[PDB]
Structures are given as structure tokens and as C-alpha cells.
Amino acid sequence: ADRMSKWTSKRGPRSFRGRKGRGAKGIGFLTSGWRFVQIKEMVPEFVVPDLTGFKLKPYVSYLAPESEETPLTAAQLFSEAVAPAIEKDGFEPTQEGKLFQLYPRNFLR
Amino acid sequence: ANFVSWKSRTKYTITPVKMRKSGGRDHTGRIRVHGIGGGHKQRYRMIDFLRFRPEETKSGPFEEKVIQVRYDPCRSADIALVAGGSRKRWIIATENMQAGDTILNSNHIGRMAVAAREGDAHPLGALPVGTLINNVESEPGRGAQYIRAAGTCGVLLRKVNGTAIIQLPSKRQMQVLETCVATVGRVSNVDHNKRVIGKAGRNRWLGKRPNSGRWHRKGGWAGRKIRPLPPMKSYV
Amino acid sequence: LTYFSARKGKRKTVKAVIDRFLRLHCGLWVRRKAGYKKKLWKKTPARKKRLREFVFCNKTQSKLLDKMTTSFWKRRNWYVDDPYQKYHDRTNLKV
Amino acid sequence: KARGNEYQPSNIKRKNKHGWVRRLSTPAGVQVILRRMLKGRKSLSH
RNA sequence: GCUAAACCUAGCCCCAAACCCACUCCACCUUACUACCAGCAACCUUAGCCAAACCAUUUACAUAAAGUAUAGGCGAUAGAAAUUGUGGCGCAAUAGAUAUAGUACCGCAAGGGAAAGAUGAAAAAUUAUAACCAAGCAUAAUAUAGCAAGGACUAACCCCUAUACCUUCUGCAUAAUGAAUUAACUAGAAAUAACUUUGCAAGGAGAGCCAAAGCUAAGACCCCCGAAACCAGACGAGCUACCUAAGAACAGCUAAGAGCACACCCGUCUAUGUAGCAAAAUAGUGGGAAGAUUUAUAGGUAGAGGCGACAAACCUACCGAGCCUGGU
RNA sequence: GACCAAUCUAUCACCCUAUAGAAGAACUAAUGUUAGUAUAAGUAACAUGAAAACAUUCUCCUCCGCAUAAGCCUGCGUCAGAUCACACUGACAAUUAACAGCCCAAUAUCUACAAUCAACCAACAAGUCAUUAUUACCCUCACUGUCAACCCAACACAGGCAUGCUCAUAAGGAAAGGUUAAAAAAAGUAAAAGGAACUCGGCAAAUCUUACCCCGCCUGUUUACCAAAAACAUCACCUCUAGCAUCACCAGUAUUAGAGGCACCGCCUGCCCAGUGACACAUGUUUAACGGCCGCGGUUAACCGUGCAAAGGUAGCAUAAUCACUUGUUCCUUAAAUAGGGACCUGUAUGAAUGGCUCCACGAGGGUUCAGCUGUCUCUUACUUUUAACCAGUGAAAUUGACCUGCCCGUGAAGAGGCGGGCAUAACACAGCAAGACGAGAAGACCCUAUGGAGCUUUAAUUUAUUAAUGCAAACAGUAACCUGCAUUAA
Ligand SMILES: [Mg+2]
Ligand SMILES: [Mg+2]
Ligand SMILES: [Mg+2]
Ligand SMILES: [Mg+2]
Ligand SMILES: [Mg+2]
Ligand SMILES: [Mg+2]
Ligand SMILES: [Mg+2]
Ligand SMILES: [Mg+2]
Ligand SMILES: [Mg+2]
Ligand SMILES: [Mg+2]
Ligand SMILES: [Mg+2]
Ligand SMILES: [Mg+2]
Ligand SMILES: [Mg+2]
Ligand SMILES: [Mg+2]
Ligand SMILES: [Mg+2]
Ligand SMILES: [Mg+2]
Ligand SMILES: [Mg+2]
Ligand SMILES: [Mg+2]
Ligand SMILES: [Mg+2]
Ligand SMILES: [Mg+2]
Ligand SMILES: [Mg+2]
Ligand SMILES: [Mg+2]
Ligand SMILES: [Mg+2]
Ligand SMILES: [Mg+2]
Ligand SMILES: [Mg+2]
Ligand SMILES: [Mg+2]
Ligand SMILES: [Mg+2]
Ligand SMILES: [Mg+2]
Ligand SMILES: [Mg+2]
Ligand SMILES: [Mg+2]
Ligand SMILES: [Mg+2]
Ligand SMILES: [Mg+2]
Ligand SMILES: [Mg+2]
Ligand SMILES: [Mg+2]
Ligand SMILES: [Mg+2]
Ligand SMILES: [Mg+2]
Ligand SMILES: [Mg+2]
Ligand SMILES: [Mg+2]
Ligand SMILES: [Mg+2]
Ligand SMILES: [Mg+2]
Ligand SMILES: [Mg+2]
Ligand SMILES: [Mg+2]
Ligand SMILES: [Mg+2]
Ligand SMILES: [Mg+2]
Ligand SMILES: [Mg+2]
Ligand SMILES: [Mg+2]
Ligand SMILES: [Mg+2]
Ligand SMILES: [Mg+2]
Ligand SMILES: [Mg+2]
Ligand SMILES: [Mg+2]
């Protein structure tokens, strides 16, 4: 009997305690006989490259110069990638069957 | 409110159906019948009132045989499984309906009468005059909608053109088509009216609450009424 | 009585007084004796003659009738032909 | 007997009798939640 | 001198003026802050309190016409048109919006609801203003006798006097209610008409209204708290009454809605308690304790109603019909 | 009628004043509200078992304790400071699934012999657990709960709480802050002679118990929270209604259901439709429906003379739970009997399913009693504890106009501590007191006023909003069958 007490998994009964739970993000499902199925495709794979011979460092030196901030826009990217437009003197309009679709967020981060 | 009646079954089955007690409540939740609720658990038994019914790829008369005679907690009249052909079904158990006995289920209305036994079922068009019957149907292919309780018996009076005036146990006549199906003999479980409840324990187990405690004043309707028999209720 | 109305916010006159009385500019209220039209067969001729005559009102009654009316009813009455034209003004008086 | 103890806590019954689903099923709970939001309370319903 | 007393700035009310807000990242109608899979949803004459001393028809949602016509148990009352044309003689923590905030607290639920602070230019000033002002105490306990006060007295007491206040009622200390003081808040808003004084006059007023001395303008007059109780919808069967589904409990002894007796269910009686252990407790004598028995979980029955082995009993401590909201 | 404390406004003021405009303009009281503080009051309530090296040991109790569903969310572990002493304030980190939860692809489709050691014995309340063939399927350990002295009762609350376990032990705890034992009360131990003789009552504590009356079938329930029953309900009987199917009443059918009166079993339910209701029953039925069963004069009365209707109380029981008579008469039960019981109708207002009478078992129901029983008393006493007083700590409420508060006589809005006359009177404190201060808590609940209410009852005054049936209208078929509007009927 508390309104300010935020409802969580440490309050309700066994049913709601095991149903809700913290941000678990369902990775698989159950198969009748309480036999969870770990879908290998849904398990994330941390793509970590090799940090061999890295030049930069997580900290910069104050001796470096200072430059103005200019948020990149679509016009600048178009002006940069302007090779075929000038050669006229390749584009992906429809990307429904593409690997990582742009408009519908299908790629993680 | 949320109230889904247990009565939900399509195909006929032999197994007892899990009965859910009602308690005199409607779909809303309010009481509509006083004196119902709180009893012993029971399992409904799907009964097939329509005696004559040709199975698949069949039509002509068929024969059946009784296997066992059991008790029915839903109604006061006991029942008895009777298998036939390539299927089984439950039907009302008539008096002197021993097990392992063959029963006929005809339909072809013969010219002359037919000395029907106690278990066989024939249409009214082939039954002698003045023969007790039960499980009378209101129309051809309708089903037992009247006589069915234990110890009941309907005596035949006469026939007119293509109908038959039946005499219900309550001295209330009734005329029905002659081509309808019926059953001879009387229902089993005789002497049920003489059943001595003995104690309130059995009455409570049966599932019937007692009457209220209000001392009602007997109005004018509490007098002895000697009304005449109502007119014959026909159905032609 | 209604000292203040609900729509405009002013006084209100009781129409019963206007229908049962008559206003005069001289400051007097004229009325009519009751019973002048019921059970006239049992009344002696003198009683009938006295009942068929107008009567004035008292000071308290006149003030009550005035309070039950507004300034609109105190206006003159220059009717083209009215029998009470020679009564609105009172002449010859010394306290 | 002791009449100072009537409360039998139970999250199930509490959330079933005063739940967002029950408060939005009928317009009564809708108006209740609207009035609560208009009042300015922190918690709208259990 | 302990306890105390004051600071006034954050913010509030009025219109004067424009018509407002609203997705970074995940989450939200299932049990709200829950990544994931086969089924109907909408449009409703508001009632009621109150006044007629009851109460049914009745009672309200720029100026002039006009509070006229008209309607009205023709009584209490209701009542039209044609025509017309960017600051505070405000408030300054009991005031101002309830607000430092719709915060705990009552709570299962609708629903109700307050205060935080005080010197300033430096608190990364040590170090404190000037004590003084109410209510309770210390500095400082009483010394025949009696509404606590007077005439006095060279002197406190000693001398004589007098029956607390307000309201009621013909009548009062009366033993009729009110009262521990202190600081803050707290109870007469105006009307057809009338009286006094200004200005003009058979006219005045900045259309309209009144005129056989009249009108205009100002001044002066109409209290507060207090029920039982109704309407419409929410909130309420987690305790009590009933119903539904699936479970649990009942030693032992004598021997069947059998008998004694554990656990267990209720409490016929004594005693204690009575601001207590408890806004319904503690021991036995008490009836049952394989059955009309008790109970863990969930769902359903909500007031003109539900339920009811009728106790006209219960429906969240007060049910001859629970509380809230708006009429009040 | 004459003045006037405070504020803002327009006017020179300016150690605080004047002229006019405004009132949220001026408190000894409205069991008025907010804040602190007196009053009983340092009075009521209160805890912590003992020794000690603070290692440890000793005394007593236990129906309590273990894990879990319901429920809480870190709530007596460490670190520094705060204090009956601390569970108080800030950081530390716990609690890791194998236990439980998070759960099932489709199509036709089917489970008659319950459990109770289930085999003998069977019974009624008829009962909780199953699958068949085809298609597609092959990746496998993801998430939540895991603590405590803990939940609901405003409190650290003798209170309320289910499941499997030894229920007294391997669990679980300390009734005594320290001294004395004034008075009063309560829980226990015993009592010289009586065992219910104080008492309306055999009402606490002990024996353990014999025979009666009223009522209730017995079990069971009732007014949680003063009345627990002689009331409520029915196993048994009886009255009325219903001829039928798709949400219950019903997946039921006249031996079945619904609405009622009484109380099982035994003897019985005698009479009356003038009046009301229900049946159109061709004019009558229904009283086990609403209700009723009479008077005047006579040899302490049959039978005569009769009047009226429905009969004029039949059987039965009797001083009743039965209007005064009532403490009846009548014989006992004792020393006394308005306590108890054997018979009389004279109960004039008893009397039959609004049920009359007996009876098998029974009653926390209401009243008596024979042989045993206890301090209830005759007449009370001794001991332990609770408890009380003092020494240390904290620490309320009801209440109070101020009190410097005596007594007697008479008065007094009619009972005087404050009044008229007399007696008395040094100062305060503890230890008991309940005669008075018409003592203290509740706008007396008994009586009365309220053109203030609410519950209940209809033949009180009004409207049929609603249900169902009636006559008419449109509405279609016939010839020479659902909605809608207008009035009536019962609810
Ligand atoms: Mg309490
Ligand atoms: Mg009024
Ligand atoms: Mg009125
Ligand atoms: Mg106009
Ligand atoms: Mg304020
Ligand atoms: Mg304020
Ligand atoms: Mg002082
Ligand atoms: Mg004095
Ligand atoms: Mg006064
Ligand atoms: Mg007064
Ligand atoms: Mg008087
Ligand atoms: Mg007094
Ligand atoms: Mg003049
Ligand atoms: Mg419940
Ligand atoms: Mg009950
Ligand atoms: Mg008793
Ligand atoms: Mg007491
Ligand atoms: Mg009993
Ligand atoms: Mg027993
Ligand atoms: Mg037992
Ligand atoms: Mg109410
Ligand atoms: Mg004051
Ligand atoms: Mg008072
Ligand atoms: Mg006061
Ligand atoms: Mg005292
Ligand atoms: Mg102790
Ligand atoms: Mg645990
Ligand atoms: Mg002590
Ligand atoms: Mg002796
Ligand atoms: Mg003795
Ligand atoms: Mg005596
Ligand atoms: Mg005696
Ligand atoms: Mg006695
Ligand atoms: Mg005995
Ligand atoms: Mg009984
Ligand atoms: Mg009571
Ligand atoms: Mg009781
Ligand atoms: Mg009964
Ligand atoms: Mg019965
Ligand atoms: Mg009779
Ligand atoms: Mg008597
Ligand atoms: Mg003490
Ligand atoms: Mg002390
Ligand atoms: Mg008091
Ligand atoms: Mg006196
Ligand atoms: Mg006195
Ligand atoms: Mg008093
Ligand atoms: Mg009074
Ligand atoms: Mg009234
Ligand atoms: Mg009223």
C-alpha cells in the first residue's frame, strides 16, 4: 500500500515477479517443457577489432590547435560526393531489400 | 460481468463433462432464483434424447443393445449406455431395462398395429391404442420435450386423421402429428417420489439452499383453486 | 416583493396591486369594496348602494401600495377622455 | 472481536480493483484519471 | 534571564493585451513505465435545495424601451421585441492562490490536505544586537478573615463597606449555558420612498425619466457560525452476507448429519481492564471438532441497490440505508 | 447628536500632527480557529534475571520453533559522531539456481467401471488427473524471487494470520531499576462447627453429581461491537403457478421446477365465501387465504319461548410466556412456600398446519429439588505475588473566571465557604477519606415545540414513468403476422 513506491520485481507475487522482471530483452522463447531455446541469431556479437598499432590516444594534448565547430549537413556531403554529377557534363533510391535499411531502424547503433 | 456458461460442446461425447455450478445467478451477477447454490460437485453426462437417428451412411431401421445401467446425478431418472452399429450414446433408462438386452428403433409406419415391447421405439402411427409411452416429441425430428422425469408415463388415447391425442401425466391432453417418434414403456427409477430425504444433510448435498426467514402473509392466492382442465393444446 | 431583479437588477411591481387598485397623482389610492358582485339578493338596498361606490386608502395602505410599485406608475395620465381627469391634482388645502 | 484489522494486503487484488487497465476500460476510470491529472497529483493510480 | 518578541521577500487577486502548449535516447491500455504473433466499444428532456411560512403547476444561468406588455395554484413570482447606438487610495507568512506542494498523513480505494526562512558590504566576518514588550518560572514561599478593591492609615495585614462578566427572562453570584491568559483572524453589503445641503427654475440632467414648484448631485439605513436531508456519477464484497473454480485441515479414545477429547471454529458466566494489552484484551467452566464444518488463492453480486438459515442484520470502526464531488 | 486610536490617497508638515475621500475602519466571552505556555504533575504508565576474568558460568519458562504461499523493502553487521544504553545520523555490500515463476503449432478426434492400504465388505453426496493419424520442426541454457529481529492493527501494540514437520526437545526467551511492605483492590495456598442458612438467582473456587415443569424435532445460524434465546432455517405435511429448449430457471421436463403456510415421527386439521383477494369457468368455487365461531326469563343446569346471521368454540389443554381477579381454590414438598408440582373451568380476550394434546433422544434456553461440596455468612484470619510507598528517568488526558477556600442559625432564581447575626482561626508537607463544591466526558436517550426530517403501512391527496392484457387507428392476406399513437385494467 504505497503510491510513491515504484513497482518492480521485488514487490508482487511469484507470478508477476517472474513475469515482469528488469530490462531482460527477450532473446529466445520457451518450448512447453520449460526448455528455453537460445536463438544464436538473436544473441549479440560484440564486433571488437584489434587495437594493434593505434596512433591516437583517449586524451588529447593542450598544445594542439583549436578549430571552429561546423555540424555536417546533407548539402556538404552532397557537394563532397559530387563525382558523377560533374562527370555527367550511382545512387540507391529504393533500399527496401537492403542489408541495413536506413529509414526503418534495422541496424543496432 | 464475466460469466461464460460451461455449456460449450459441439460433437457428442460419452465422457462426463465437467459441470460448473450456477447458483441462481445470471450473466450479470444478480440472483434470479432463491434456493440454489452450494452442493456436491457433479459431472454432466451428454444424453441423446432423439432416440431414432440413423448414423452415417445409414437410414433404414437399426438395432441396439444395452450394456450397463448407471445413475444420473443431473436428473432424477437414471440413464443407461446403449451401443449400436459403430457408435455409442446415452438414452433414458426405461423400467425393466436390464443390461445385455436388444432394443429396436424402427420408423416405417406399418399398416396394422405393432405389439411393441418395453424398450423398442416406434412412431405413434404403429402403436396400439391405450399403451403407455414416454419421451414424446413435439414435432418430427424435434426430440423429447415433455415426458422424461422418473416414474412418468403417458397413456395413448386415440388417433385422428394423422395425429394422436396424448394424455400427459398431469391430465393435460395434447395432440401431435402421427409421424413423430416416441418411446414405449415408462421411465425407470420408480418409487422416486417416496424417496425419504431423512435429514437436511442430503438436501444440502443435493445443492438446494433453504427458504428465507421472512414471515410472509398468505395473500388471497393461497386458497384452494379447483379450476377445470385446460383445452387440448395442439401443434398441427 | 423582489427588491432586486435577476436580469436587469431593479425593482418589480406586483401586478395584483395594479389590477386591484388605481394610482392617482394627488397621492391617494382608489379601490372598490369587496362583495359588490356576490350575494346581492340578501343585501338591503343601502348596503348595495354603499358597496357600489369607490373608496380611498389609508396612509399605511397607501405607503405599502407605493412601495409595491415603481416610479413608472407615478406618471401623469392625460387621457383623451377619462372620468378621473379632474382628480389627479388636489386643490384647496391648508395642512 | 478486534475491528481494527480489516486490511488483507494482496498486490493481485489491489492491481485488479485499481489498475490502469480497469481504470481505462470504462469511461468512469477515464474521467477519474483526467480529474486526478487536472488536480496535479504525483501518482495517478496503482 | 531561561523561555520569548519584530524583521520581508518569494509569491499572490483584478482587469487593462495577445488567442496557448505539445517527440533528443529507450517505456508506457497486459499487472502502466512490461521489444515481440489470429477479433462488441459514440451520440440520451439533468435533477435537486430553496420561496410562496407545507408543497404537487411554479423559483434566475454598452443605455433606453421596461421592470411595460405578457404568462402565472391569475398568488408567490417570472418577464421580450418592434425601435434605439503595461497600474493598483490591493495583500506582506494565522493575510495574500491550499501551496517552498497538491508533500506526508487517513488509505485497498474515490476522496481531504500546512509551516518551513528572518542582522548585513565580506560567514573563505567567529563574534555577535543592546538587555528592555505578553503568556510559564528564578532573582524574591507562605504569617488570623473570607470577589482579592476602596476611605484611609505615620504602617503591608489589623479598622467599616460591598453577593464576578455577558445572554435569556417579570425576577440572578446564584447551583442555567460561555470561559486559562496571551498574539493573529472573526460577525450590518443596499432598496420604492423619506430627511439635510449644493445648481437651475415652470425646468433641470451630457437623448430616454419626472413637471398645479419641480428635478439633478452628494450625505445617511437593512450580520456571522450551527443541523437532520435529497439529486447525478464515481470509490468500495482484500472484513462482513451470498455464489463460482481448483486445493488444504481435522491427534487419540469409545463405537450413525453417534459420544468424549488435540489442533481448530465462536464466546453463555465470573474477575481484571474503562485515556487500558486492545477506538472490543486476558483463564476455565463452555457447543462442535468426517461434516449444514473451517480456511489459503482468484472472480462475480453496490444503494430506487446487493445480500440476507429475517438479525428490517451486514455492505471498511458510527448503515432505519457508508463517504466524495457540484446544486448547498 | 458631539468627538475619536490605525491605514492609503491630494495638500507646506519631517521627533508624528491638520483638512476631505474608504472601510477587511476599533474585542472581558460566540463548549470560535492557529502558536507557545500554567492546571492536576513531577502524580497515573513504564521497562533491565544473577555473579564475574565481561572469556565464562548459574536460576527459571515455553502450544513454541524451523522453511514457505500472502505481505515489507534493507529496517539491532562494520566504519566516525550522537546518549537505561542504543535499532539515530552519512559510506561500506550483501541475496549468485539445481527450489518456484516466466510455457504448449495446426487439422478430424475420445476418456461407462471414482478415492477411502480397494482384494474380500460395500454405500450414496455419482465422483479431481489418459489419447489416436498427418504436416513442419533439430538451434538449447536467457530473465525474475533468494537479507533481516520482517505482515495488518495511528505505538517497539498480551490483538489477527495458512501449509509439512518431535510437539518437548538437538529449537525459542528472561515475569525481579534498587530499598520498606502504610491503607485499599485483584490472582493463588489453609482453615477450628454448619455446608448455600447473607443472597431475587448454586453467581467465582471445590465436588462431579439425584428427581421435576415450560418451550423448542434434534444438529446448525442469528443482533461482528451490551440481548446467542422460549427466535431463525427443515427431514415431514399441505396451498397455488408453469406443457417448454437454447446464457441461469435448464443443456432439467408434472415423480420436474418456481412462490408460500406449518413443523419430523403418533391422535387429529370440526363449522362458515355475509365482507376483501384469486379463479370470465354461463352466476358458482376457493377459508391448510385475509378472518369469525352469539344474547335475554326459568322449576345450582339439561330442556322450553325464541331474535339474528357464518357458524354461533367441536375435540383438546389448563392459574399458562395467556388483561387486574392473580399471592385462586385445592394436597404435598420445609421451621416458615407470591419458589416447584397432582385436578376445577370460572381462559367471556385459550382452542386446532396464525396448528390443539401426549411422547423416543437432546438443550451454554427459561424456573425447582434429594445424599455429598466448598469463607458466600455466622466472625473472618495468616502467607506469596500482582500491587502500594521512598530513592533515581522520562513523562499525559478529562478540568480550571479569579480564590486570601471553615462552622451554626435565617434569607436568597426557592439546598450558601464569600449574604444579616454568632463560634473559630500560627505556617505550610506527606500517609488514608469520598459527605459537599447540585463534582468531571455526552446540546438527557424519559416529557414537550418544530407548517425541520427519515423508516414502515394503505381503503390518506395525486401521476400511471415501467411491465402484461384489452377497444380504436396505419399495416398487409379472404370474401360477398411483428413495431407505433390514443384510453381502461392488476402490479
Ligand atoms: Mg486502532
Ligand atoms: Mg429559503
Ligand atoms: Mg417551499
Ligand atoms: Mg432590439
Ligand atoms: Mg498562507
Ligand atoms: Mg495563504
Ligand atoms: Mg513576563
Ligand atoms: Mg480588590
Ligand atoms: Mg453581551
Ligand atoms: Mg442574546
Ligand atoms: Mg418571563
Ligand atoms: Mg456559577
Ligand atoms: Mg410643491
Ligand atoms: Mg472476501
Ligand atoms: Mg449466514
Ligand atoms: Mg446468557
Ligand atoms: Mg468501569
Ligand atoms: Mg446448538
Ligand atoms: Mg463433542
Ligand atoms: Mg476428533
Ligand atoms: Mg448516503
Ligand atoms: Mg485578543
Ligand atoms: Mg463549555
Ligand atoms: Mg474565545
Ligand atoms: Mg490531583
Ligand atoms: Mg524484567
Ligand atoms: Mg528468506
Ligand atoms: Mg521498581
Ligand atoms: Mg469440622
Ligand atoms: Mg469452618
Ligand atoms: Mg438477610
Ligand atoms: Mg436465603
Ligand atoms: Mg435458593
Ligand atoms: Mg443426577
Ligand atoms: Mg432446536
Ligand atoms: Mg449487543
Ligand atoms: Mg452474547
Ligand atoms: Mg424451517
Ligand atoms: Mg427439512
Ligand atoms: Mg377449524
Ligand atoms: Mg391471567
Ligand atoms: Mg506505581
Ligand atoms: Mg520519582
Ligand atoms: Mg472532563
Ligand atoms: Mg445557598
Ligand atoms: Mg457556592
Ligand atoms: Mg455539573
Ligand atoms: Mg438540550
Ligand atoms: Mg424542510
Ligand atoms: Mg425538508
Curated annotation (Swiss-Prot), chain A:
GO cellular component, one term: mitochondrial inner membrane
Keywords: Apoptosis, Cell cycle, Mitochondrion, Ribonucleoprotein, Ribosomal protein, Transit peptide
Tissue specificity: Present in kidney, liver, thymus and testis, and at lower level in brain and spleen (at protein level).
Pfam assignment, any one: MRP-L27
Annotated transmembrane regions: none
Localization terms from the record: Mitochondrion
GO molecular function, one term: structural constituent of ribosome
Keyword presence, Ribonucleoprotein: yes
Biological process, per Gene Ontology: apoptotic process; mitochondrial translation; translation
Coiled-coil positions: none
Annotated function: Component of the mitochondrial ribosome large subunit. Also involved in apoptosis and cell cycle. Enhances p53/TP53 stability, thereby contributing to p53/TP53-induced apoptosis in response to growth-inhibitory condition. Enhances p53/TP53 translocation to the mitochondria. Has the ability to arrest the cell cycle at the G1 phase, possibly by stabilizing the CDKN1A and CDKN1B (p27Kip1) proteins.
Known partners and oligomeric status: Component of the mitochondrial large ribosomal subunit (mt-LSU). Mature mammalian 55S mitochondrial ribosomes consist of a small (28S) and a large (39S) subunit. The 28S small subunit contains a 12S ribosomal RNA (12S mt-rRNA) and 30 different proteins. The 39S large subunit contains a 16S rRNA (16S mt-rRNA), a copy of mitochondrial valine transfer RNA (mt-tRNA(Val)), which plays an integral structural role, and 52 different proteins. Interacts with BCL2.
Protein name, UniProt field: Large ribosomal subunit protein mL41
Native species: Homo sapiens
Curated annotation (Swiss-Prot), chain B:
Gene Ontology BP term (one): mitochondrial translation
GO molecular function: RNA binding; structural constituent of ribosome
GO CC annotation terms, alphabetical: mitochondrial inner membrane; mitochondrial large ribosomal subunit; mitochondrion; nucleoplasm
Family note: Belongs to the universal ribosomal protein uL2 family.
Region of interest: Disordered: 204-223
Self-association state and partner proteins as the record states: Component of the mitochondrial large ribosomal subunit (mt-LSU). Mature mammalian 55S mitochondrial ribosomes consist of a small (28S) and a large (39S) subunit. The 28S small subunit contains a 12S ribosomal RNA (12S mt-rRNA) and 30 different proteins. The 39S large subunit contains a 16S rRNA (16S mt-rRNA), a copy of mitochondrial valine transfer RNA (mt-tRNA(Val)), which plays an integral structural role, and 52 different proteins.
Comp. bias (Basic residues): 214-223
Keywords linked to the UniProt accession: Mitochondrion, Ribonucleoprotein, Ribosomal protein, Transit peptide
Coiled coil residues, start to end: none
Localization terms from the record: Mitochondrion
Species for this entry: Homo sapiens
Domain of life: Eukaryota
Name this protein carries in UniProt: Large ribosomal subunit protein uL2m
Shown chain mapped onto the complete sequence: 61 to 296 of 305
Major site of localization recorded for this protein: mitochondrion
Swiss-Prot record, chain C:
Keywords: Mitochondrion, Ribonucleoprotein, Ribosomal protein, Transit peptide
Main location: mitochondrion
GO molecular function: structural constituent of ribosome
Cellular component annotations (GO), alphabetically ordered: mitochondrial inner membrane; mitochondrial large ribosomal subunit; mitochondrial ribosome; mitochondrion
The keyword Transit peptide belongs to this UniProt entry's keyword annotation: yes
BP GO terms, sorted: mitochondrial translation; translation
Superkingdom of origin: Eukaryota
Subcellular location: Mitochondrion
Coiled-coil stretches noted in the UniProt entry, renumbered to this chain: none
Keyword Ribonucleoprotein assigned: yes
Quaternary structure annotation from Swiss-Prot or TrEMBL: Component of the mitochondrial large ribosomal subunit (mt-LSU). Mature mammalian 55S mitochondrial ribosomes consist of a small (28S) and a large (39S) subunit. The 28S small subunit contains a 12S ribosomal RNA (12S mt-rRNA) and 30 different proteins. The 39S large subunit contains a 16S rRNA (16S mt-rRNA), a copy of mitochondrial valine transfer RNA (mt-tRNA(Val)), which plays an integral structural role, and 52 different proteins.
Family recorded in the similarity comment: Belongs to the bacterial ribosomal protein bL35 family.
Record protein name field: Large ribosomal subunit protein bL35m
Organism: Homo sapiens (Human)
UniProtKB/Swiss-Prot annotation, chain D:
GO molecular function: structural constituent of ribosome
Location of this chain's protein in the cell: Mitochondrion
Protein name: Large ribosomal subunit protein bL34m
GO-annotated cellular components: mitochondrial inner membrane; mitochondrial large ribosomal subunit; mitochondrial ribosome; mitochondrion
Principal place of residence: mitochondrion
Keywords, in A-Z order: Mitochondrion, Phosphoprotein, Ribonucleoprotein, Ribosomal protein, Transit peptide
Originating organism: Homo sapiens (Human)
Oligomeric form and interacting partners: Component of the mitochondrial large ribosomal subunit (mt-LSU). Mature mammalian 55S mitochondrial ribosomes consist of a small (28S) and a large (39S) subunit. The 28S small subunit contains a 12S ribosomal RNA (12S mt-rRNA) and 30 different proteins. The 39S large subunit contains a 16S rRNA (16S mt-rRNA), a copy of mitochondrial valine transfer RNA (mt-tRNA(Val)), which plays an integral structural role, and 52 different proteins.
Modified residues (Phosphoserine): S25
Family (UniProt): Belongs to the bacterial ribosomal protein bL34 family.
Example GO biological process: translation
Disulfide bonds: none
